[PDB]
């Protein structure tokens, strides 16, 4: 037996985390740059979704290295495979738009 | 009202703070307001009372009496002023334990700690 009495409280604490982390990460977003990825499982195969990370080859197609891209806040998954054209292209456009909107301090 | 979270408004906590207070906090609690003349003198309203200074009584049954404090009985949150006593049926004398919130200080006993305290509280000390 357990009752979530702290449901109101923990959220507050969580936003405190979402405050406090943000304090350290002051210009940058809290979250990384995640891929837009179409789901499996025919019930959901029309659904698109947030994915974990893009790939090496896609980040190369964006025009940078993944080792550098992790410093730019772009989530990268090696074990994913890019197999759909439109997914790949839309995520490349996403990467380009993310590159357009950042300004990086030396 | 209470805006800080670190401030608390529990009656039980507040009384447990009050009655179990150490003596250094008690002389801060045992504070008396100055006269209108002394406020015109130093620009300050209330002060921690000690024993060397002079006072008048503004409430109670012994209202409109005055004197120098004999001793500050900090353990009972109280203060024995000289010459405000009950004389028992043996003929002996025992002072009324007064309370500094019911007192108005008339003549201060000024010291270097006291002068520096008046200075740090913004006093216009002569």
């Amino acid at each position: 037996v357990k009752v979530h009495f702290d449901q109101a409280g923990k959220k507050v604490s969580r936003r405190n985390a979402r405050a406090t982390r943000a304090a350290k990460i002051a210009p940058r977003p809290l979250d990384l740059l995640r891929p837009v990825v179409r789901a499996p499982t025919v019930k959901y195969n029309r659904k698109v979704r947030a994915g974990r990370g893009f790939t090496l080859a896609e980040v190369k197609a964006a025009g940078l290295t993944a080792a550098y891209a992790r410093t730019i806040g772009i989530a990268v998954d090696h074990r994913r495979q890019n197999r759909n054209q439109e997914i790949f292209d839309a995520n490349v456009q996403r990467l380009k738009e993310y590159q357009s909107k950042i300004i990086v301090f030396p | 009202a209470k805006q800080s979270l670190d401030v608390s408004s529990d009656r039980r906590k507040a009384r447990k703070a009050y009655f179990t207070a150490p003596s250094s906090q008690r002389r801060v609690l045992l504070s008396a307001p100055l006269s209108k003349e002394l406020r015109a003198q130093y620009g300050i309203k209330a002060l921690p009372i000690r024993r060397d200074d002079e006072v008048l009584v503004v409430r109670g049954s012994k209202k409109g009496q005055e004197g120098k404090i004999s001793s500050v009985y900090r353990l009972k949150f109280a203060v024995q002023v000289d010459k405000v006593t009950k004389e028992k049926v043996n003929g002996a004398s025992v002072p009324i334990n007064l309370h500094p919130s019911k007192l108005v200080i008339t003549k201060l006993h000024l010291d270097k700690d006291r002068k520096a305290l008046i200075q740090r509280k913004g006093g216009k000390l002569e």
Binding site: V1, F5 | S9, D10, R11
Partner: protein, 227 residues
């Protein structure tokens, strides 16, 4: 306590029905139903026969619903806003609240609920400009953004029609908040709900002309006792 003779009848024994935490505390409410209750409260605040029916000192106020300029929001000091409510005429309500401070009759006096007093005006603002700090110190007054409009603040004790003061921009903003037949809702898929009867007065309908045409003549309105 969990385990902390053995009888409910016994001195010091375990009690009948140890009170357990998993008894229901919060109660789920349909969202449209909650919004409907708030809408009925807001509509009730206009009337002011209801506000007198709850008990408020609003007999000398300019009109209903009382609407002040938005400049009220820009007051940042308590004495100025209290003088402003004097200039309104809600002074008697404030004095009622201030006199009404009594001590709680229960044991809950020593459960940090020591004092009790009536409720007063409710100030509705579009935007804070220091007004909520200025009215914080005066008792009985409670402020509310138009977006929230707390029902507990609206109909306290489930009695409809607390005395509510509006700022000018808030009163315009109420159209944004609830919509109309002209302005949409700003709430997702919400509609200000309909009436099942159009005319609020039944005796007007009964005594109108045409029911009064269609109806047979009436009795004595108390029966003539025969035999």
């Amino acid at each position: 306590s969990e385990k902390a003779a053995f009888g409910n009848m016994c001195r010091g024994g375990r009690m009948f029905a140890p009170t357990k935490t998993w008894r229901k505390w919060n109660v789920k409410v349909n969202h449209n139903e909650k919004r409907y209750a708030t809408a009925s409260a807001i509509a009730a605040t206009a009337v002011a026969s209801l506000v007198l029916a709850r008990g408020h000192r609003v007999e000398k106020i300019p009109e209903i619903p009382l609407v002040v300029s938005t400049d009220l929001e820009s007051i940042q000091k308590t004495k100025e806003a209290v003088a402003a409510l004097k200039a309104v005429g809600a002074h008697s309500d404030l004095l009622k609240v201030l006199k009404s401070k009594k001590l709680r009759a229960g044991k809950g006096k020593y459960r940090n609920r020591r004092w009790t007093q009536r409720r007063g005006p409710l100030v509705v603002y579009a935007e804070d400009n220091g007004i909520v700090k200025a009215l914080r110190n005066v008792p009985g007054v409670e402020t509310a953004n138009v977006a929230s409009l707390n029902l507990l603040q609206l109909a306290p004790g489930a009695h409809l029609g607390r005395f509510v003061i509006w700022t000018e921009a808030a009163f315009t903003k109420l159209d944004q908040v609830w919509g109309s037949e002209t302005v949409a809702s700003s709430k997702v898929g919400y509609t200000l709900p309909s009436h099942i009867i159009s005319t609020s007065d039944v005796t007007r309908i009964i005594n109108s002309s045409e029911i009064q045409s269609a109806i047979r003549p009436a009795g004595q309105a108390t029966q003539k006792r025969t035999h």
